[PDB]
Amino acid sequence: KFPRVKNWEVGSITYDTLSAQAQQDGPCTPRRCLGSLVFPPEQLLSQARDFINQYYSSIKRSGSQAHEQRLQEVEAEVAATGTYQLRESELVFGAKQAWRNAPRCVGRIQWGKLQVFDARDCRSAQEMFTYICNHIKYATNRGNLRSAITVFPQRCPGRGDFRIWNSQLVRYAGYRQQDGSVRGDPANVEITELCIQHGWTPGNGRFDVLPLLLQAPDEPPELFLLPPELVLEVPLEHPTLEWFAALGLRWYALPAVSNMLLEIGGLEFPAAPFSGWYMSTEIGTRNLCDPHRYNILEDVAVCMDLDTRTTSSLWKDKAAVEINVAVLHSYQLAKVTIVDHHAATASFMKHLENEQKARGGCPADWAWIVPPISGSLTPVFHQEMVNYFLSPAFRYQPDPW
Amino acid sequence: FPRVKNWEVGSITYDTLSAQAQQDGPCTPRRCLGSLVFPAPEQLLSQARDFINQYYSSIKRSGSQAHEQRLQEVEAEVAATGTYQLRESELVFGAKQAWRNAPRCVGRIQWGKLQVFDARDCRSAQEMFTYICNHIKYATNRGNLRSAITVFPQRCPGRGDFRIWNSQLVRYAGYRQQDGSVRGDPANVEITELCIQHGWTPGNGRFDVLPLLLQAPDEPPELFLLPPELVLEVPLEHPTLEWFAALGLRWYALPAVSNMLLEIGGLEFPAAPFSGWYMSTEIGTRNLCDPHRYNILEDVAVCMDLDTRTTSSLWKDKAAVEINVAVLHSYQLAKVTIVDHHAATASFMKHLENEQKARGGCPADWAWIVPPISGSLTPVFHQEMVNYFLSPAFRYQPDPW
Ligand code: HEM
Ligand code: HEM
Ligand SMILES: N=C(Nc1cccc(CNCCc2ccc(-c3ccccc3)cc2CN)c1)c1cncs1
Ligand SMILES: N=C(Nc1cccc(CNCCc2ccc(-c3ccccc3)cc2CN)c1)c1cncs1
Ligand SMILES: C[C@H](O)[C@H](O)[C@H]1CNc2nc(N)[nH]c(=O)c2N1
Ligand SMILES: C[C@H](O)[C@H](O)[C@H]1CNc2nc(N)[nH]c(=O)c2N1
Ligand SMILES: [Ca+2]
Ligand SMILES: [Ca+2]
Ligand SMILES: [Cl-]
Ligand SMILES: [Cl-]
Ligand SMILES: [Gd]
Ligand SMILES: [Zn+2]
């Protein structure tokens, strides 16, 4: 009943006893596995009680007098108002745990180091924009990136929601044509046409930084431009292919995801943007080489004078590696924090070891932990994993439109 | 029915075929175990009936008098004897269906092209060896590789099974060095020590072809030496790195898995070796660069004058790509069939499309279908997959010792 977990490189065996505490059900059944799919009152009280019990257990104040007082407080608040309020310390712990619980995050070695900005007093999109700019400023830190989350007011009944319509704080526009294709990032064609309708006059470049569509409850969203000095970017060059710089490729320093819902003790924060730093394959492999993203692989291979008319020359593999080399080199030259996929998967193995001792396992999504190049060259390829949902959690949520 | 999305193209299918899954997998709504490597006459009759229905469906004669008579014939034989015999045509169809149903096989575009050798009248380990040698001869075909399976007698009560103890017909010895290390292939250390145990004089090279341990019913295994002219091998060289040839690397032409159980209509064939041809990442990435296999990555990188002290030079990725290049170049030079991971995954995408039309789905294990290098450079990375167990099937089975 406790799954056996084997590492095939070393032969080590562990047992995931944590999977028993999985609060929610995932998409798989004994009949069929859907692990590869991207998108798989008294009720509030039971989740709220569960989280408080987690928190006090985690500070060794379990069952003490402060534990019961907080339990009765949430009872009264929910009866009085329909909801309740986290103490600032509970919010901090709950955000760290939602990161710690994210099965698809290879960066969780860092989970204990997260700057939490409490923006639960926010109202209006103008204040929203100020909190976000402070977050971006703090997290970018002149290239020495620091992990941070900003928590905007929770959802509650009768009232609208706070939403960041952009999937990330920094996104490059994507524009379609009468020739059908996209110039810029195809991933952002939708948010680009939304920003246009809500005021923004569009650029025409391959890396036009999008504005922010920030939404206060019930109010339509307001359009905000980001101070260019706030948005650190890294122009991409290669250490030995001197023509690589002339492709005009660039990427931004700060990955800051703004469209996920943070859930803590049954509360729901539809706007809680978090940022850390990049793993280099996210940029060099997925963002630049995916067929449905910038799709630059063949351009680079033509410049490397590779034989592209036969798959078996491995021209795709060679071009991809050099693009990832360029990313690592360009970020290091610019003194912007970045981690290559070998270092990051090595640290995730350590995190698996630490979590086994900390709580008897660790939820992990193999398909997302294994890097998209050089999979089996990294230790996580050889590591069996168990995926399950724990709360607090980061969850997907529907688009505000 | 599970909705299945391709994220490159945006296309969407529903896997209705999964609803027919017979046997249960390892996953539950509470936890996904999809990344784990190793997860009475009445049941026989329902399995036989289903298989007979499958056969008559395949030849577009469902509900025909021949269909009904054959069901009654199977029913009568099971009632009288507790088991039954396949018709030859059913054996051929069942072996092809078992390949078609194998979720971890990326080469299933070929599933209709399989030479089925019927060895169900085999009576001794010596006759086994003759049947195996003819298989290797046929399938190797002096490098123009042809897919084939040889089906030895089914399991039946009151008699031991036929078994091939070796995991493949052609395997390199793995000599347990006394330093706790291994000379040769570490995957084959167990079968190597059983070969010596049974009287084989061992070599000391890194690419010593193992002898076969063949088991006739109720008989200890017997040792048989493969004729050297029957075992086609490919010396490994690199098209532009001339020193690569001096590594002394080799691999064999013919991948012929011999330790899986073939299951058709509830009958079980514990010895049914099958062979096709290699996808190059199997040799170049896993067999040569896995840390727990030949583990040549660092040595090749040093010969390439790469900086092996920092991960961020991507020296592992660069050496791995050249080793895969050497494998593809060397097999092409030797005129031995091989497919690269780009072509194989593209053909697997056509197979998924064929199977969606033909059967409404296709069982597929994403973790095994995505190649171990350049995963997201291949189209299967972006394809959601549904994993489930259909029959006929190739199954893992316990080792005979
Ligand atoms: C600090 C260094 C970090 C690194 C190197 C890192 C790395 C990654 C990577 C490579 C992914 C896969 C993303 C994709 O493929 O689209 C991911 C996913 C994720 N990360 Fe981390 N991350 C870091 C920090 C954080 C932080 C601070 C949080 C939240 C507080 C976080 C929460 C998540 C979540 C929830 C996902 C899942 C997203 C999804 O399911 O789509 N990560 N991370
Ligand atoms: C025709 C060329 C073929 C190619 C290129 C191919 C490719 C592959 C590859 C690359 C794997 C993964 C192996 C590993 O990583 O250990 C695999 C697995 C598998 N193949 Fe194919 N294959 C071919 C033909 C066949 C044939 C003829 C059969 C049987 C009649 C077959 C049945 C299977 C099965 C059952 C597995 C699963 C093995 C396991 O779970 O350990 N394949 N195939
Ligand atoms: N290091 C980081 N990375 C990272 C972590 C979590 C989430 C993300 C962003 N995840 C993108 C998921 C995604 C990718 C492509 C497409 C897409 C859609 C249409 C066409 C083509 C592609 C859609 C989605 C969302 N479904 C990045 C960090 C971000 N914050 C702190 S650390
Ligand atoms: N193209 C082909 N390929 C292929 C298909 C199916 C199975 C295989 C062999 N799969 C080996 C799985 C494996 C890998 C490593 C280790 C191991 C064990 C201990 C130490 C180190 C490694 C053990 C196993 C088997 N459990 C190859 C073909 C084979 N027939 C026709 S086509
Ligand atoms: C279909 C498949 O689940 C999809 O391509 C996944 C696979 N693994 C991934 N892994 C990461 N880290 N990020 C991703 O977006 C994906 N995409
Ligand atoms: C732990 C993990 O399941 C294991 O390393 C798997 C992953 N995917 C694989 N894929 C293939 N084709 N072959 C393998 O042996 C494996 N091994
Ligand atoms: Ca037009
Ligand atoms: Ca008969
Ligand atoms: Cl990104
Ligand atoms: Cl192999
Ligand atoms: Gd040369
Ligand atoms: Zn599953």
Side-chain angles (χ1 to χ4, degrees):
Chain A
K1 205 153 71 181
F2 289 153
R4 199 201 71 163
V5 182
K6 176 158 182 178
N7 179 285
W8 288 87
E9 185 183 344
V10 188
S12 59
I13 307 294
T14 64
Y15 288 91
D16 192 306
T17 57
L18 184 49
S19 55
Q21 283 100 287
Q23 77 102 292
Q24 191 58 55
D25 291 328
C28 297
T29 69
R31 157 178 265 88
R32 37 150 193 77
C33 174
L34 296 175
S36 75
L37 269 61
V38 174
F39 293 93
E42 256 305 314
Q43 154 88 300
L44 178 57
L45 268 111
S46 49
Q47 300 175 78
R49 290 197 200 100
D50 291 358
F51 169 70
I52 301 297
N53 299 323
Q54 295 180 227
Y55 179 56
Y56 280 82
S57 283
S58 82
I59 59 179
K60 292 106 104 66
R61 306 279 88 251
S62 26
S64 56
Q65 192 71 294
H67 184 183
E68 263 77 12
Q69 252 172 45
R70 185 50 181 153
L71 284 169
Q72 271 82 108
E73 288 180 24
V74 291
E75 303 262 0
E77 232 201 300
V78 169
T81 75
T83 181
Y84 72 102
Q85 294 303 317
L86 301 163
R87 299 179 167 170
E88 201 170 46
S89 62
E90 298 161 349
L91 175 72
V92 167
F93 167 84
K96 283 181 185 185
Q97 287 295 124
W99 180 10
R100 181 196 197 180
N101 292 338
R104 303 176 156 179
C105 185
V106 75
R108 284 177 282 167
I109 194 70
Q110 290 282 330
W111 74 265
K113 184 182 187 180
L114 173 66
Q115 176 63 45
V116 178
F117 288 123
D118 181 355
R120 294 173 293 158
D121 20 331
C122 181
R123 95 288 294 177
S124 110
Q126 184 62 59
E127 198 174 347
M128 230 183 173
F129 179 79
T130 299
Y131 275 115
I132 286 173
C133 291
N134 302 329
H135 178 142
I136 293 169
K137 212 188 182 216
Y138 173 93
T140 299
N141 187 24
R142 305 186 180 185
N144 181 20
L145 266 41
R146 297 177 294 193
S147 296
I149 189 171
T150 302
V151 188
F152 286 107
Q154 59 209 242
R155 167 180 304 152
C156 58
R159 156 203 154 278
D161 269 333
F162 281 99
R163 287 303 294 274
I164 307 176
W165 283 33
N166 304 64
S167 73
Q168 286 186 39
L169 302 185
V170 191
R171 296 265 80 188
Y172 292 129
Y175 318 105
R176 245 171 317 195
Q177 274 87 15
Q178 198 193 26
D179 108 301
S181 69
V182 176
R183 176 181 169 89
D185 194 344
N188 308 317
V189 171
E190 187 162 28
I191 188 60
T192 298
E193 46 215 15
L194 282 184
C195 287
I196 278 176
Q197 295 187 5
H198 292 43
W200 186 59
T201 52
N204 59 48
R206 300 143 82 206
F207 302 99
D208 300 331
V209 177
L210 269 148
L212 265 10
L213 279 178
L214 308 186
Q215 182 196 270
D218 303 303
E219 301 200 350
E222 301 192 330
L223 213 242
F224 292 87
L225 276 66
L226 275 166
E229 128 248 64
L230 220 69
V231 192
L232 186 54
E233 286 171 278
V234 176
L236 296 189
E237 63 179 66
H238 190 280
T240 62
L241 299 164
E242 55 283 301
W243 50 256
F244 193 100
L247 296 168
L249 310 167
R250 39 210 286 116
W251 206 260
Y252 47 92
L254 192 66
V257 174
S258 52
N259 69 352
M260 293 190 85
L261 189 153
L262 171 53
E263 186 253 313
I264 309 174
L267 307 185
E268 297 173 338
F269 304 87
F274 56 90
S275 58
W277 51 86
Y278 266 115
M279 184 165 73
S280 53
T281 51
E282 305 181 71
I283 308 165
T285 306
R286 300 305 309 283
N287 297 346
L288 297 176
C289 293
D290 271 1
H292 49 302
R293 299 290 299 289
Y294 278 81
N295 186 27
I296 72 175
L297 204 57
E298 190 156 14
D299 295 313
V300 176
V302 166
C303 293
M304 300 171 62
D305 297 308
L306 298 177
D307 183 358
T308 64
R309 31 159 187 78
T310 164
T311 51
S312 60
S313 77
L314 304 195
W315 63 266
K316 292 183 170 185
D317 316 71
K318 297 189 219 145
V321 170
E322 292 320 315
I323 292 153
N324 283 263
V325 169
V327 163
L328 286 159
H329 162 88
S330 298
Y331 274 64
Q332 288 159 5
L333 188 64
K335 284 284 166 297
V336 175
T337 303
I338 192 132
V339 64
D340 70 72
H341 49 289
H342 305 286
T345 57
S347 79
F348 186 71
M349 298 298 299
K350 200 73 180 59
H351 173 74
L352 289 177
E353 196 151 333
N354 298 337
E355 284 296 78
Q356 193 63 32
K357 292 171 270 179
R359 38 187 211 169
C362 172
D365 184 336
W366 193 95
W368 281 62
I369 301 292
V370 178
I373 50 169
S374 299
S376 73
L377 310 190
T378 64
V380 291
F381 184 96
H382 310 285
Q383 177 59 64
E384 290 178 343
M385 294 169 195
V386 189
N387 190 2
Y388 47 97
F389 176 97
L390 297 178
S391 181
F394 291 102
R395 311 169 118 119
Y396 300 130
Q397 64 182 340
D399 282 303
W401 59 100
Chain B
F1 298 112
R3 175 172 54 83
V4 183
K5 177 165 190 175
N6 179 286
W7 286 86
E8 175 176 347
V9 164
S11 47
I12 285 179
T13 63
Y14 293 88
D15 190 318
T16 66
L17 182 58
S18 63
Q20 279 162 70
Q22 186 79 307
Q23 211 195 96
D24 277 359
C27 299
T28 68
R30 349 192 75 268
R31 39 148 194 77
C32 173
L33 295 180
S35 78
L36 275 58
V37 173
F38 294 101
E42 203 46 53
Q43 77 309 318
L44 173 58
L45 197 264
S46 48
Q47 287 170 76
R49 173 107 78 273
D50 171 69
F51 169 70
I52 294 313
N53 293 340
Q54 285 187 52
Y55 174 84
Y56 276 91
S57 226
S58 78
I59 61 170
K60 286 77 181 166
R61 299 294 170 197
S62 294
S64 66
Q65 287 202 344
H67 185 188
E68 316 293 340
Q69 294 173 15
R70 175 60 173 153
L71 294 164
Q72 281 186 229
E73 187 175 84
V74 165
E75 287 186 48
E77 187 172 357
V78 169
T81 67
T83 189
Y84 70 109
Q85 299 293 321
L86 301 179
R87 291 168 171 173
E88 169 144 28
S89 63
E90 291 159 0
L91 179 63
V92 174
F93 168 79
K96 291 171 188 182
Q97 286 288 111
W99 183 7
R100 181 195 201 176
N101 292 335
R104 291 170 163 178
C105 183
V106 71
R108 289 178 273 164
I109 193 78
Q110 290 291 326
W111 73 270
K113 184 176 177 170
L114 181 66
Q115 179 64 26
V116 180
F117 295 107
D118 179 2
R120 284 175 302 162
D121 249 295
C122 195
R123 290 175 310 148
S124 65
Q126 172 71 55
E127 198 172 359
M128 272 194 103
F129 180 64
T130 300
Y131 268 119
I132 289 167
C133 289
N134 295 27
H135 177 134
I136 295 171
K137 198 176 172 190
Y138 173 89
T140 302
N141 190 29
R142 288 216 255 86
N144 187 14
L145 269 40
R146 292 181 284 210
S147 299
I149 182 173
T150 299
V151 183
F152 289 106
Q154 69 205 50
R155 170 174 298 153
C156 64
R159 194 213 61 194
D161 307 322
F162 285 83
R163 290 298 292 272
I164 299 153
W165 282 31
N166 308 65
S167 57
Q168 297 183 29
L169 297 182
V170 179
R171 274 316 235 183
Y172 291 129
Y175 304 117
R176 178 51 59 121
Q177 290 307 112
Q178 192 97 26
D179 331 81
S181 65
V182 174
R183 190 157 157 82
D185 191 342
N188 303 321
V189 128
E190 204 174 11
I191 189 66
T192 301
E193 276 131 43
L194 288 159
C195 285
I196 304 167
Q197 240 201 236
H198 281 80
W200 174 63
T201 306
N204 54 343
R206 301 170 80 195
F207 305 98
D208 292 334
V209 182
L210 286 171
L212 296 178
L213 277 172
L214 306 187
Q215 181 186 284
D218 313 290
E219 221 56 79
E222 208 183 322
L223 204 65
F224 292 87
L225 305 184
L226 287 168
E229 60 276 20
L230 211 69
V231 178
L232 183 51
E233 294 178 87
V234 178
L236 295 201
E237 64 180 57
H238 191 280
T240 58
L241 296 166
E242 282 75 17
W243 48 259
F244 196 93
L247 265 27
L249 300 177
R250 313 153 57 85
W251 207 258
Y252 49 91
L254 182 74
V257 173
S258 48
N259 66 349
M260 293 185 78
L261 184 145
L262 167 67
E263 186 248 297
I264 300 168
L267 305 175
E268 301 177 310
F269 299 88
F274 57 85
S275 66
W277 52 83
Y278 265 118
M279 177 166 84
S280 43
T281 52
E282 299 179 76
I283 302 170
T285 304
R286 302 300 311 284
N287 298 349
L288 295 181
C289 300
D290 271 5
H292 54 300
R293 298 291 294 288
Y294 280 86
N295 185 38
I296 75 174
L297 196 55
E298 192 175 76
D299 193 356
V300 171
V302 162
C303 292
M304 289 172 67
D305 215 346
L306 304 179
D307 175 21
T308 60
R309 278 172 305 103
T310 177
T311 60
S312 50
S313 64
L314 302 190
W315 61 267
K316 292 192 194 176
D317 317 67
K318 292 177 173 187
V321 169
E322 291 320 310
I323 289 155
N324 282 261
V325 164
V327 169
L328 284 159
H329 163 80
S330 302
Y331 275 66
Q332 287 157 7
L333 187 69
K335 303 204 317 290
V336 174
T337 301
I338 195 152
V339 63
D340 67 68
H341 50 290
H342 300 296
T345 52
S347 82
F348 186 74
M349 295 302 290
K350 185 88 236 294
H351 177 71
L352 292 175
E353 178 186 317
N354 292 346
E355 290 293 83
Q356 194 62 34
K357 280 135 58 194
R359 300 206 288 181
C362 172
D365 183 337
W366 189 98
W368 275 61
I369 300 293
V370 177
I373 51 165
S374 296
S376 72
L377 306 186
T378 69
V380 295
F381 182 100
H382 311 284
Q383 179 61 62
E384 286 173 357
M385 298 177 198
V386 186
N387 192 8
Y388 47 96
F389 175 92
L390 309 174
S391 185
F394 290 104
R395 309 205 329 250
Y396 297 140
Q397 55 176 337
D399 284 316
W401 61 86

